[PDB]
Amino acid sequence: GKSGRRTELLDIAATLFAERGLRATTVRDIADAAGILSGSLYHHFDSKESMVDEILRGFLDDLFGKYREIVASGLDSRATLEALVTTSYEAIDASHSAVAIYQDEVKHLVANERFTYLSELNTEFRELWMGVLEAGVKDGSFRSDIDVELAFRFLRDTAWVAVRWYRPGGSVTVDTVAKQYLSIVLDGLASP
Amino acid sequence: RRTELLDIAATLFAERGLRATTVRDIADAAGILSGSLYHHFDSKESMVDEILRGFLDDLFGKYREIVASGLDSRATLEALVTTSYEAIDASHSAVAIYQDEVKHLVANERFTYLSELNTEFRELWMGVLEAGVKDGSFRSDIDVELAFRFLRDTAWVAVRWYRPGGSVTVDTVAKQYLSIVLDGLASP
Numbered sequence: 169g170k171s172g173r174r175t176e177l178l179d180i181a182a183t184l185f186a187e188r189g190l191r192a193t194t195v196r197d198i199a200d201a202a203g204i205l206s207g208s209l210y211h212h213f214d215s216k217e218s219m220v221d222e223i224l225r226g227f228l229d230d231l232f233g234k235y236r237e238i239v240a241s242g243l244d245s246r247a248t249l250e251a252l253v254t255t256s257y258e259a260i261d262a263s264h265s266a267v268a269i270y271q272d273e274v275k276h277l278v279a280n281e282r283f284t285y286l287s288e289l290n291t292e293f294r295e296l297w298m299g300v301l302e303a304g305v306k307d308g309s310f311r312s313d314i315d316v317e318l319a320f321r322f323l324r325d326t327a328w329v330a331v332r333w334y335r336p337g338g339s340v341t342v343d344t345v346a347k348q349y350l351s352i353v354l355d356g357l358a359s360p
Numbered sequence: 361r362r363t364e365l366l367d368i369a370a371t372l373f374a375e376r377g378l379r380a381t382t383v384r385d386i387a388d389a390a391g392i393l394s395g396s397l398y399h400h401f402d403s404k405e406s407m408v409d410e411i412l413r414g415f416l417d418d419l420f421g422k423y424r425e426i427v428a429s430g431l432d433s434r435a436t437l438e439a440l441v442t443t444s445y446e447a448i449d450a451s452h453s454a455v456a457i458y459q460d461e462v463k464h465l466v467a468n469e470r471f472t473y474l475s476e477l478n479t480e481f482r483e484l485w486m487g488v489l490e491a492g493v494k495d496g497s498f499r500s501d502i503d504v505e506l507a508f509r510f511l512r513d514t515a516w517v518a519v520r521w522y523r524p525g526g527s528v529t530v531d532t533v534a535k536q537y538l539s540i541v542l543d544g545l546a547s548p
């Protein structure tokens with residue numbers, strides 16, 4: 169009973185945070201959406217803050233666990249990059265609200281002690297992905313005339329942007345979207 | 361003076377966000393009294409409006425000229441993208457406000473122009489994509505709708521890190537990003 173309700177309340181909060189933003193969503197907004205009063209919410213959660221933290225960690229622990237294993241898995245450089253990107257798109261489908269909060273809603277969490285892990289993960293994401301780029305330039309998979317930091321920043325800044333329009337459960341599979349993004353970024357939009 | 365103040369406001373909007381910025385915040389940052397602000401502008405909202413319009417009017421004027429200019433399909437796309445990047449360098453705060461700070465204004469009446477500009481951006485950019493697929497410039501095996509979404513999704517994202525006076529110019533950034541998008545990151 170209680171554990172399932174907790175999960176439901178947390179998902180309602182995630183959806184409101186993704187739509188309205190973190191700073192503009194109150195515990196009363198969450199409670200209203202759940203058909204309860206704020207007191208009932210506090211029986212399950214310490215704070216709005218703790219809800220955000222749990223939503224972000226659920227998503228990021230899983231995501232970074234996959235990134236880390238992909239890079240350690242022995243795939244060649246192009247396949248490694250393809251797997252990393254595909255994993256990101258799969259999260260847009262599976263964890264849509266969390267991705268939206270991560271992409272558009274957490275600029276201002278950097279100021280908060282409790283969310284220092286976000287900056288650590290930014291450092292780590294660069295290490296992982298830019299490392300793959302470096303290895304693929306060295307091994308001939310990727311072009312040697314593109315700056316690796318610029319290429320990294322392009323990948324980083326375009327990882328989550330589809331969350332603004334992508335609808336989970338639509339006829340357009342997140343897989344179709346990943347494959348096309350990868351075909352453009354790796355092989356180019358121009359006719360060969 | 362009115363221009364200096366508007367720029368200071370734009371920086372605050374981009375750095376704090378619109379709703380976290382008050383008139384007194386803008387006044388304080390400008391080292392002036394709030395009363396002096398109201399001499400130039402009637403509201404925080406009117407300031408946002410003028411910042412966005414200045415940027416978007418110039419931008420879409422250039423997009424319209426480029427599409428009308430008779431370049432080949434790839435060169436037209438290259439020019440449109442390069443124009444977007446030049447706006448990130450020239451109007452950094454305005455781009456940040458447009459890209460990241462106005463989700464709550466899209467449904468607002470006085471900012472109806474945002475939606476009209478989505479439509480126009482599509483007319484102009486999707487027109488170029490479709491023409492380039494037709495003339496053999498761009499691949500026929502790609503989903504043109506998803507390709508457009510990718511060009512639109514990614515136009516402004518470098519605003520979060522790019523600043524004037526960095527170690528390379530925005531022209532270098534534009535050229536490298538065009539090279540990836542058009543020719544691919546993989547080796548031949």
Ligand SMILES: [Mg+2]
Pocket residue numbers: 332
């Ligand atoms: Mg939405």
